[PDB]
């Protein structure tokens, strides 16, 4: 998402191929959610 | 990290210097981590 920009849906462009776009913020958010889950497990379980 | 882009390692450029590149996202993430650690520590005690 840093070297790409979004403009509309993908029903207009002719020849648009369709592949995963990586988002670092979501990756670190998921990692921190996993860390919080581990902390909660250490708290109760 | 917003001012600059990363390309390669430090063993190729002639004249590369020794300096910290500040990451605001990592700074706020570490602040959140410290806050959550203190929260859990005072919750346990
Ligand atoms: C490109 O995506 C199209 C659009 O489908 C969407 O994206 C897919 C990756 C998947 O998550 C779908 O559920 C999404 O709706 C894909 O075309 C789909 O093809 C499947 C298999 O026949 C069909 O069930 C869906 O209905 C199609 N989607 C639509 C909107 O008609 C296409 O497969 C993707 N390209 C590649 C190379 O996988
Ligand atoms: C630029 O710094 C690197 C590494 O950072 C230094 O060491 C850390 C442990 C920490 O104390 C930092 O603040 C320091 O700035 C230096 O790379 C080292 O170079 C030596 C000599 O060639 C080599 O033996 C080490 O393996 C290197 N270490 C790494 C991690 O690459 C580098 O030399 C510094 N630049 C200059 C001109 O001295």
Swiss-Prot record, chains A, B:
Top-level taxon of the source organism: Viruses
Glycosylation sites: 18, 42
Role noted for this protein: Subunit of the fusion protein that is processed upon entry into the host cell. Mediates fusion of the virion and cellular membranes by functioning as a class I viral fusion protein. Contains a viral fusion peptide that is unmasked after S2 cleavage. This cleavage can occur at the cell membrane by host TMPRSS2 or during endocytosis by host CSTL. In either case, this triggers an extensive and irreversible conformational change that leads to fusion of the viral envelope with the cellular cytoplasmic membrane, releasing viral genomic RNA into the host cell cytoplasm.
Protein name: Spike protein S2'
Species of provenance: Severe acute respiratory syndrome coronavirus 2 (2019-nCoV)
Shown residues in whole-protein numbering: 1117 to 1161 of 1273
